[PDB]
């Protein structure tokens, strides 16, 4: 029952995690989720245990929303490494995609301004008010954060940020990095 060629193979192209790593975690996931399935109230529960510093119920339900990709309202053990590694592993510039697909909240194509506030909102409770203080001023709470994401996308209140722009702008403003930032700890090490 070792872990299948091809879902290491994606795993590995989409993490660095090796294999010998991912096939071991593999067989201790089946032991404690038999079905090889984790629901989302599992899933929160793995982020309040080990965030117990922040408010982390949005942010995980978000992420799980994110990675359920098959949209069964469960994760499999290749969703969950992905969203593990979405949180806290690997460099931001490749997982654009998946960053767009975490502030896509009704998953209609294209971000909106509200969309924004919610995911920059989620985000924000993953730092402990402790950290919070450090933030540069007119970067100190969601509201001042999400206000300037969609003012460096140019955008009118209406508007809908495509793909292709999100991406864009990541890469090339990293102001724009820098607030969209959705790993806890990243968001730490910049304030
Ligand atoms: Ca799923
Ligand atoms: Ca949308």
């Avoid at 996931?29 to 899933?43: N, V």
């Avoid at 993953?126 to 450090?134: F, L, N, V, Y």
């Avoid at 702008?169 to 959705?182: C, D, H, S, V, Y």
Wanted: with cysteine; aromatic share 12%.
């Amino acid at each position: 029952g070792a872990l299948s060629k091809e879902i290491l193979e994606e795993l590995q192209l989409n993490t660095k995690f090796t294999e010998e790593e991912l096939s071991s975690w593999y067989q201790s996931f089946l032991k404690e989720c038999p079905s090889g399935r984790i629901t989302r109230q599992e899933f929160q529960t793995i982020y309040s245990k080990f965030f117990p510093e922040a408010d982390p119920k949005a942010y995980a339900q978000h992420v799980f929303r994110s990675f359920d990709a098959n949209s069964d309202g469960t994760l499999d053990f290749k969703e969950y490494v992905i969203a593990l590694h979405m949180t806290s592993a690997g460099k931001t510039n490749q997982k654009l995609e998946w960053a767009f697909s975490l502030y896509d909240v009704d998953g209609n194509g294209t971000i909106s301004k509200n969309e924004v506030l919610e995911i920059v909102t989620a985000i924000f409770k993953m730092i402990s008010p402790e950290d919070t203080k450090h933030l540069p001023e007119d970067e100190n709470t969601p509201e001042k954060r999400a206000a300037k994401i969609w003012g460096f996308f140019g955008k009118k209140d209406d508007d809908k940020l495509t793909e292709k722009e999100f991406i864009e702008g990541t890469l090339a403003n990293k102001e724009i990095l820098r607030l969209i930032q959705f790993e806890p700890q990243k968001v730490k090490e910049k304030l």
